[PDB]
Amino acid sequence: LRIETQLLLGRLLTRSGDQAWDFVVPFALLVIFPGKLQVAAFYYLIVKIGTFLLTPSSGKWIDTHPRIQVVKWGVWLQFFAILAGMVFFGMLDGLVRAGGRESWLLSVLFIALALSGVMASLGSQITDISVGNDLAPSLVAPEKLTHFNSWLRRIDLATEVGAPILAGALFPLAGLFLIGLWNLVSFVPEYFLLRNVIQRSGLKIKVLTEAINLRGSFSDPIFWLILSYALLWLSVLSPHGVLLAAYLKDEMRLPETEIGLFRGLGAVFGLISTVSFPYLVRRLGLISSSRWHLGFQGVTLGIAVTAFAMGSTASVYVFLGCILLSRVGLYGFSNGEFELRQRLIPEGRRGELNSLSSLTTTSATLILFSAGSLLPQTEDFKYLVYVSLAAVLLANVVFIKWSSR
Ligand SMILES: [K+]
């Protein structure tokens, strides 16, 4: 295998395990604390807030250590976080099965679980930045990055579609530990693949920074590109969106069978961007392809939101169809912004400025989570819809302004 293929193979193996694990954790939480959806929510919250708080530090840590150290800590932090998580899950499940109720002990084990979730999430973010935003632009010719990124996207979508299937086959909570085990094992090929390409090549030579402040990050021009991407995470208009599903079910009275297919079609339209975006790049260049895809997301969601406004079931399939089309735009733009970060971010600032990107997208996630919790009613879904559209149009404005560079 050539270098580029080794990178993709490593990503494919470790992701299939990551996606399988992320899929089953909420269900495992619900098995242990039956009914209590607030507990699963609390888990997710701690992980995200935790990752948020550790992000600037981790980006400085990335720029000040050799790559082989970054990859070692990135992967093995995950490995041992997942192992710790499995141990705490087992303990929790054992405790509750044996009749344990609310206690400091049970609480302490939940916190230990949630913190291990923070470590894994942070390790994963470090590894993504390292492989996708440092190793890849250092190993792959600039003109072949678009091709390389489209395969990274295909791996992400494929393992995303394969996750419920994998999990299904393997699934009290015995399925969880089998998924945990597969996840553990799936970290190992990527560690050694990465370690061996670093050991044998010029990745060893890298000037490190000695030895937060975020003023330097936010003041950099690339932050506006970063903001144009992050804004897209604010939307409730997604195939997987829980508030949209709730809305479609109660207000639109769509059958649950049609809602599930809609949800499942997300991946397909994501996959379509991996053909449309590279095609436009090769024809119009990276900036122009990005602008067209982002505009396509803006137009299709504009149409979808007009169809939502005249709130008839006579317009519901155009609403859903346009949301699905918009995913082509979103997934295309996401590869473009990713590639612009690969190409434009100085080598010595790869940890810093890409962690800024993680910081801003995690913030968007937290806001979206906050809005979901604050406006949980289907009759209020209307307001989240208009703010989602506004965010997308603002993203277009910000990117157009930025791409005047
Ligand atoms: K993994």
Swiss-Prot record:
Changing residue 190 to A: Complete loss of calcium binding. It holds the Pfam family FPN1. Residues 33-36, 98-103, 251-255, 309-314, 375-377 are extracellular. Its main location: membrane. Ca(2+) binds at residues 18, 78, 183, 190. GO terms for cellular component: plasma membrane. Gene3D superfamilies: MFS general substrate transporter like domains (1.20.1250.20). One of its GO terms (molecular function) is metal ion binding. Keywords: Cell membrane, Membrane, Metal-binding, Transmembrane, Transmembrane helix, Transport, Zinc. It comes from the Bacteria. The keyword Oxidoreductase does not apply. Its cofactor is Ca(2+). The chain crosses the membrane at residues 3-32, 37-63, 67-97, 104-139, 142-170, 174-200, 222-250, 256-283, 286-308, 315-344, 350-374, 378-403. It is found in: Cell membrane. It is a multi-pass membrane protein. The cofactor facilitates a conformational change critical to the transport cycle. The binding of Ca2+ from extracellular fluid activates the transporter by triggering a conformational change that enables the transition from the open outward to open inward states. Residues 64-66, 140-141, 201-221, 284-285, 345-349 are cytoplasmic. Belongs to the ferroportin (FP) (TC 2.A.100) family. PANTHER family: SOLUTE CARRIER FAMILY 40 MEMBER. Iron transpoter that exports Fe(2+) from the cell. Also binds to Co(2+) and Ni(2+). May act as a multivalent divalent metal transporter. The transporter is composed of 12 transmembrane (TM) helices organized into N-terminal (TM1-6) and C-terminal (TM7-12) domains. The substrate-binding site is formed at the interface of the two domains and is alternately accessible from either side of the membrane. The transport cycle is viewed as a series of ligand-induced conformational changes that include open outward and open inward states. This is Ferreportin. It comes from Bdellovibrio bacteriovorus (strain ATCC 15356 / DSM 50701 / NCIMB 9529 / HD100).
